Each structure stands twice: as structure tokens, then as C-alpha cells.
Amino acid sequence: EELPPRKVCIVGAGVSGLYIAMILDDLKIPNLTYDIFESSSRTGGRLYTHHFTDAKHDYYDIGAMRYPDIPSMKRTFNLFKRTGMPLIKYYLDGENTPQLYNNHFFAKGVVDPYMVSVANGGTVPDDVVDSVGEKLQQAFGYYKEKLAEDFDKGFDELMLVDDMTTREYLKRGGPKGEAPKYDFFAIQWMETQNTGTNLFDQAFSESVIDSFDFDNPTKPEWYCIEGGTSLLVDAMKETLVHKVQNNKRVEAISIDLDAPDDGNMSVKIGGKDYSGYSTVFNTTALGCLDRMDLRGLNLHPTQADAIRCLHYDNSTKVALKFSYPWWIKDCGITCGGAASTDLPLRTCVYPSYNLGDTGEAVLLASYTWSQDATRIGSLVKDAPPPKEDELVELILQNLARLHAEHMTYEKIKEAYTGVYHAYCWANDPNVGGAFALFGPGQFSNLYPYLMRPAAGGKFHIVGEASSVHHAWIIGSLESAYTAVYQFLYKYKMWDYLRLLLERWQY
Amino acid sequence: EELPPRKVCIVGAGVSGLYIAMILDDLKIPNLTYDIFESSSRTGGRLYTHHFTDAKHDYYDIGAMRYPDIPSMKRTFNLFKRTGMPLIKYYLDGENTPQLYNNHFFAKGVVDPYMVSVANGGTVPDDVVDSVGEKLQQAFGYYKEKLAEDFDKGFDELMLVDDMTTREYLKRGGPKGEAPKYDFFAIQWMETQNTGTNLFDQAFSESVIDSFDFDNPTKPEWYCIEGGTSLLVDAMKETLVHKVQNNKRVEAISIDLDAPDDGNMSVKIGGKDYSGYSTVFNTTALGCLDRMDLRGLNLHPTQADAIRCLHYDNSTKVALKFSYPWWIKDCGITCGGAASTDLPLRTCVYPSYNLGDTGEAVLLASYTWSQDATRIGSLVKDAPPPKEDELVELILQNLARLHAEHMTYEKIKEAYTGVYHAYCWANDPNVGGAFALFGPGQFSNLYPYLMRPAAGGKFHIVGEASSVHHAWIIGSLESAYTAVYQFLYKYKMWDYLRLLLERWQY
Numbered sequence A, B: 001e002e003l004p005p006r007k008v009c010i011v012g013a014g015v016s017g018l019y020i021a022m023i024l025d026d027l028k029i030p031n032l033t034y035d036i037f038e039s040s041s042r043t044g045g046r047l048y049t050h051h052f053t054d055a056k057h058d059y060y061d062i063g064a065m066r067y068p069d070i071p072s073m074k075r076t077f078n079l080f081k082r083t084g085m086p087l088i089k090y091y092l093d094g095e096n097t098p099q100l101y102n103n104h105f106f107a108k109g110v111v112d113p114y115m116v117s118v119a120n121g122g123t124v125p126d127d128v129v130d131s132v133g134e135k136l137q138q139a140f141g142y143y144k145e146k147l148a149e150d151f152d153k154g155f156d157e158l159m160l161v162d163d164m165t166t167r168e169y170l171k172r173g174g175p176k177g178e179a180p181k182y183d184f185f186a187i188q189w190m191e192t193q194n195t196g197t198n199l200f201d202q203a204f205s206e207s208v209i210d211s212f213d214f215d216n217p218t219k220p221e222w223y224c225i226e227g228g229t230s231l232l233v234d235a236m237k238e239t240l241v242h243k244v245q246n247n248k249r250v251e252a253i254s255i256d257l258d259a260p261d262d263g264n265m266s267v268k269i270g271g272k273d274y275s276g277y278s279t280v281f282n283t284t285a286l287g288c289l290d291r292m293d294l295r296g297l298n299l300h301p302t303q304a305d306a307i308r309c310l311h312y313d314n315s316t317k318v319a320l321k322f323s324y325p326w327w328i329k330d331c332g333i334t335c336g337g338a339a340s341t342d343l344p345l346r347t348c349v350y351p352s353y354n355l356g357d358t359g360e361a362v363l364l365a366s367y368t369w370s371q372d373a374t375r376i377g378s379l380v381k382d383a384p385p386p387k388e389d390e391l392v393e394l395i396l397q398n399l400a401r402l403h404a405e406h407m408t409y410e411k412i413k414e415a416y417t418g419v420y421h422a423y424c425w426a427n428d429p430n431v432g433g434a435f436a437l438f439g440p441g442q443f444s445n446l447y448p449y450l451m452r453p454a455a456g457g458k459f460h461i462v463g464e465a466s467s468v469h470h471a472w473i474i475g476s477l478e479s480a481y482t483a484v485y486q487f488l489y490k491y492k493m494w495d496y497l498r499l500l501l502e503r504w505q506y
Ligand SMILES: Cc1cc2nc3c(=O)[nH]c(=O)nc-3n(C[C@H](O)[C@H](O)[C@H](O)COP(=O)(O)OP(=O)(O)OC[C@H]3O[C@@H](n4cnc5c(N)ncnc54)[C@H](O)[C@@H]3O)c2cc1C
Pocket: A011, A012, A013, A014, A015, A016, A017, A037, A038, A039, A040, A043, A044, A045, A046, A047, A062, A063, A064, A065, A066, A067, A248, A249, A250, A251, A283, A284, A285, A288, A289, A315, A316, A425, A430, A431, A433, A434, A435, A462, A463, A464, A465, A470, A471, A472, A473, A474, A475, A476
């Protein structure tokens, strides 16, 4: 045919790298091939299901686990459709889930059940202690509703306040001082009830977008993948024309500007050079890109500074196997959902995929973020198997306190099988963190320099951090789609660019 | 004698716990004993020297390593005197140390050597790019000089602005908007040149106190301990009347309010109860205290919230052994100091304790904080020994770029012995972090509730975080001293309280 031989390089076989390869396989551009290199021995990146055994429900999702049916997520559910993903309902809110703060259980209708307000000798203002949801919907609500109208325009309006942290916004009452002003302890309590420890000190725009996703105006249903999110990776993996090359950690990316041809880019793997690429799509988390030698690409200094400085949140999960689902049978927690607490485990997630089992059951006993995750992570080994006895003992004791209304410590201990697994994303060298969670001013100042193609339009920084949808599959997918667009555009492949718009624009 | 038998419990054998025991041994209060329990098999906590071998200079300090001779540090140098510590000069600034940002070496007298300013197509304002030190001394200088006058009063005046982050202070120009206002990229560059990644998003008071310690107005000399900071632990350890009990991890602290006697406090260790304590001094980092069952102490909710929420900074060190000190012989870096860079290693510290050696030499190749430390930490194992090959390769490549003016990669590689060691404090279960580094408003709001004795004046939260001198030995020592004071006071031991003031108040 007409189009000259071209070869592109995809760095990373997570969902964004796999999506790029899937788009290319679909477009069937003549004489175009790709190599996809993955540092880990495992494919999927932050799509990661841990199977204790291959029994139907004997797993937990270490990375992505739940997906809300909202318009901005269409591209995700389209990917689920293309791959035949078996979806089931995910109960964000179930029933009878305990909530434990300051050693008091939540009680419906009671004033200050946790006894943390000034009226009971605490420091939380009485006007705040029981109206956290309402006060935050007043600080976020305008932006959240504009994000439902149209996410891109809603995002642009939110960028007018991006210089503020959530705590800053609440202390001053908006950019003009017109919204309510809150003291420290009121802001602290709103953070304690709404997110993870310290996270109101990150961007206000990120708190708004997380409220938009977890408490969307259209009260959506949630879904998960029966058999684990890694089924998606398997489906995508197997469709590929060129298989993932695992155990291939890219150490350098370069473009030879002394050579005028299309394929003048290289990557270095294990000290060996891989050359002849007309475009390199990097899909790693930014911490991994930060460690590569990128001198050969002549990046803009501020783009380089974004790679180093864009903030990543931590996250840790601990899953315990029990001989029967005691939370279902003894506590009446029959419909998924999650228990929240100021105890170290913070959040205990009841699986939505084993609701009708009666024997061995997995419990996502601890799901943490930020400093909470770093503290649990200090007791965790991501490769290995003393400090994880300490971890197990800690989780069991927190679990007994959290379910004290119906359960004793001895009974939870007796039901425990001795099988557990835990994971801390910051300790994963292939990610270096859990997911982007920008600081104040980062989305409006650093991000646009992150997203500009480099090496004369041949280098793309792709992935969840390269999107407005951090910590969601949708970000990875949009960013991947956008990079393919720029690639086609850059090489003036107008027939295939139109074909992309028809077959792949949602 | 008159005084009835009493027994106190010291949780943790770091420097604050060891100092408490040393004070008590000195006061020789009749019928008073103590137990000191340490979770680790090793004593010293964040005083931690790693000896590759027992040769005189073949070590690096994983925790504390350097001490500035300033008035607020007197108590530390007094402890050094009491224990016979061999001090030598520590060169904060040495000579010929390279600085590498945006792949350009620093050049004295050049305008924008790193080529990051707007005038060269960057984003750093031209009025900022080369005057970072001056602009920050204008934002900090007033407070730093008042801290030299008198640290306690200087600290109290700094608490009037404690609600602001450093970035907030710089974006608005002080609490009244009277100081200069800086845009994002100017603030970003000040952070890049002055501290670790993202740390201007923490408290402005903490940036001020770090500028006060590392750039004190009285331009002080710095010292380190010849043979490693762990010599201090050995000296303190050996003087104790009651030896540290290692491998004793406290899991719970309680007071039995149904029993009226002095010794009504207990701790739980390995599920066994240890009772009969008239006071418990907890000296652990707060993340460790957060994991204990403290229901038996009826803590104030806001005190509990401080334990969970006070922010900890991360820190990671990597030390490599070389067959000769090539930085001395080939690069003319003969007087210690440190090289700084935007490369992943961030800071390379040249030891001040092997300046005259010519054979095998240790290099502190990487010293990082915050998100920089988490990223290096993801390649590190704190107990164990693939990802640390990646770590070594990364450090060697960064070292070649940083010393490119006098060294090649192959030559640095050839000089490398294959012996290295690395450590990440956030991954240490016995600490859970590196050291306190408070967020906005935390020092002025959460801290005072941290410091109030609990359990009717019998429970003390002691350590560096329980002081105004975070991440310094002086904080631990002051906080320990203060807890002993309150203990004596609480039990009306007036003769021994005066004796404390005579023998131990600096
Ligand atoms: C704890 C957690 C929970 C989440 N929950 C949800 C959820 O409920 N719903 C949802 O929609 N999303 C969720 N997400 C987000 C989602 O999992 C991610 O956004 C997405 O999977 C990231 O895909 P990616 O391809 O952009 O990045 P990655 O998954 O990180 O892919 C990058 C790949 O590059 C590889 N790599 C790294 N360095 C190199 C190198 N030098 N050379 C070669 N390869 C390299 C990595 O091993 C990895 O496989 C969650 C994320 C986390 C961390």
C-alpha cells in the first residue's frame, strides 16, 4: 500500500496501553505495527485482581473495583461491552453497615452520636457536627451540577478556583469570601467524615470531582466485574495482534534529531537499544516516567517539573478470608456497602459479589488512602509474606470493635481462616503511588504542560494522570484515545482519523 | 523511706524514652522504678547508624546525622557532653559541589543557568529564578529573627499565621496581603530550590522553622558524631539501671478508674497484661500510638484526632560503598557538603567523616523527603535484600549525570563495590513515617490537645512530634524533660521537682 512502514512504541501494558493497542488493531492501518513493553511480569497495571484460589468468588480487586453509571463513564462501559464483561450490581450503600467514630456507633436521629461537638466537650462546632454532607454540598454543589451539564465546561469553570485547597476554600468561604467560613475543627471533621486523612490539604477541584463521582447528582447505580476487574485485562490482552512483552522495563526514551526519518525514536531496555519508532506512547505513572533518562527528548522544563511534582495519593487494601460470611449471617449486613471509622482500618468494604454464599468468604477488611494508607502500608509486604502478623492482629481487633453490636473478637478470630493478602500501591515500584491527586494550582498550571506532545509531536504522556478523571479507568481511556488522535493528526492520516471519530468517539 | 513504691512505664526506647530513663536514674527517687519496652529488636528508634562493617568510617546514619550549634540546641549538646560523644565538624556547605537542574549545571554569576525562566522559554518569572534565597528570607526573615531572640515567644507570634501553608502565604503575600504576591511557577521554583517536592503545601510555620534551623541567622557550625549517631544510643543504653526490654510491642494502654491507687495503669504486650504503673510515658511516633487500643484511657476526641491526623513527612536514604572516594580525588569535592538536583536522587551528601580516607569510602548517594522519598522508597526493602538492582542502577546513572563535569558513568560504575544499603522511614512499622511535619492550622489547633496529659495526669504523649522542634533530637529531649516535670508535679514531689530544675533545665 501507500502508507510507509511505521512502528510505534507503547510503554506500559495497563489499561491505557492496552486500549491504545486495541484502537490500533481496530483501525488496521496498513504497514503500522507496535511494540508494547511492560516492566512487570504481570499485565494490567492498576487493574489487579488477587485470586486466593480460582474459585468463583475467592478474590479481591487490589486496584479498580467499582464503576458508576454516569454519562462521563460511557467510554468505560463501552469497553466493558466490547469485551463481554459480566457486570453485576455494586452496592456503594448497603444496609446495617456500622459507623464508628470516637468509640461511639452512629445512631439515626441522635444529636452528635459520636459526642465530638463542642456541646459535649469536643471541638467540632455544633452547627457542623451533624450537617457535614449538607455543608459540603453547599461548597461543591454549584460546580458538581455544572459538571453534570457538561464535564469539560464544568471543569473549565472549576479551574477559576483551582489555586485553592479544599481547606482554604472552606476557611475563606470561596474565592470572594462570600460562602460560609469554617474554623479548623469544623474543616477537620468534614474531612474525617468525607475523605481520607489530610486530603483537604490537596486541591479543592479534586475534592469537587470526587464528590461528583461518589455522590453524583443523578444518584447512579454502581457495577463491578464478576470474577474480578482482571477479566478485563485478560480480554484486552488476548485480542492483541502483538502480544505484550513482559519483564521489559524502559529506562530511557530518545529521539535522534540528526536523523530526519519518521522512525527516529528509541527506548533503552536492560541497556539494549530498541529503535525505529515513529511515536512513543508512555503510559506509566509519572513516578516511573520520572526515573527514566529523558534527556534525548528535550522536554520543556515545566513539563519535566510536572512529571516530578504532580502529587500522587497513596492507597492500601487488606483482604481477609473467613470460613463463613459472618457479617452477613450475624450482623445482617446482607447488601454490600461499607463501614467507616476513625480506627486504623478506616473503611471496611463488604463485597457485592459473594452476597449469596454461605461458606468461605473474602472480606475487604481495610481500604485506606493518603496517610492512613501509608500507616497500614508500613505493616505490608507487596512481594513478600512478623509485621503482617501485626497487620492481621490489628485488622481483627479493629473489626471486632467495628462490629461489636453483633460480634465478639473471639468469634471473628475463630471464623478467620489464616489466609489474607494486603497491598500498598506506593510500595509498588511499577507505580510509585496509587493515582494522581493534584495539589492547589496544579491542574490549572502544571497539567497543560504535561499534556502537550513533545519530541516534535511524537512523544505522548498518557494515562489517568494525563486526564481530568484521576483514579478512574475513564481517565486512562480518554487520555489514550486523545493520544491516538494526535498521532494520526501528526502524520496527517486523515482517512484513519475520521475512522477513529466514527468508531471510537463517545 | 517516705515515698511509696511506684513504677512507671516508658513505651519506646528511642532517644526520648532513653532520656526519660536517664533523668530518672539521675534523680534517684526512692522506691521509683521503670520498665522500658521497645517493639523492635534494636534500640534507638530514629537514631540509627548502619555499619556495613565495624571499620572506623564504614557506616551511614539512617536517621539523625547532623547538629547545628545554635542556642535552642543546647540540651542536645549537653546530652552529647554527658555521654562523651566524639564530635567532629559537619560541613553543611562544602566546596565544588555540583548543582543540576533542567540538565544544566549551576554557574556562578550567570543569569538563569538552569534556563528555566520565562526569558528562556520557561515559566519561572525572571524576577524570581535567581533570587529564591532572597525572596524566601523576606517571607521568613521577620519570624526567623524573632525565633533567635527567644524561640518560645517567636513561636507564639508565628502561630498567628499558622492557618496558612507556605504556598498560601506566598500567593497572598502574608495574612494582610501586604507582602509580595507570587504566582504558581514562582512558588514552585522556590520549593524546588529550597525543600522537597510538594512541601510548600504543608504549614508555613514549618517552612519558617526549617529555614531557621538550616539557615540560622547566627551562621552556626554543624557537628556530627564520629562513629555514627548510634554511639549515643549505646552510651545512653548502657547507663540504664533497668535495661531496655526489646521485642516488646505495646498493643494497648489502660487505666482502671475503679481502682483508686497510684499504680492503676496497664499495657498489653503480646496479649499479656503488665500492670501496676503510676504513669505511662508513650514515646512512639504517633502512627504507632494510633494503632494501639487506647479505649482504656478515655482520651479527649480532639487529642485522639491529633494522633490520627498530625501529618508525617517521608524520608529515604541510599548509601553506596566505593573502592575509593572518587568525589574527593577526581571531582575536588574535598570538604563534605551536598549536591542538589531535580534528578530522582535529589540530594547527594558527601560525608564529613571520611575526608582524609583514600580507600573504601561510603557515599550518601541519595537523601530525599516527601514524594521524592516515597518514589525512591518504592524501590527499597527495609528488612529484605530486583527492585534494588533497579535502585542501584538508578542511583549510579543519576550520579554520573550529577558529576559529569569530572566523571563518566563507566568510571563511577567501576569504582562501585556492589555494597549498598537503603532505607525508607515510612515503610518502618515501628515509626510509620520519618517525622512530624504539620499541615496548616495543625500546630495552633491540634497540637495543644496532643500535649495535655490524659488519664488524670498519668498519660503522656512524648517525642519529637510533641514539641516545637520536629525532626530534631532537641524536640524529643525537651518533650521528654517536660513529661518528667509533669510527672513529678502530678505526684507533688517538690524536692525532686526542684532537683530536676537544677540538674536538667537548659
Ligand atoms: C487503589 C485504587 C483503586 C481504584 N479503584 C478504581 C475504581 O473503583 N474504579 C475505576 O474506574 N478506577 C479505579 N482506579 C483507577 C484505575 O485502576 C487506574 O486509573 C487505571 O487502571 C490506570 O491505568 P493506566 O494505564 O493509566 O496506568 P497503569 O495501570 O499504571 O499502567 C502503566 C503500566 O506501565 C508499567 N510500567 C511502569 N514503569 C514501566 C517502565 N519503566 N517500562 C515499562 N512499563 C512500565 C506498569 O507496570 C503498568 O502496568 C483505582 C486505582 C487505585 C490505585
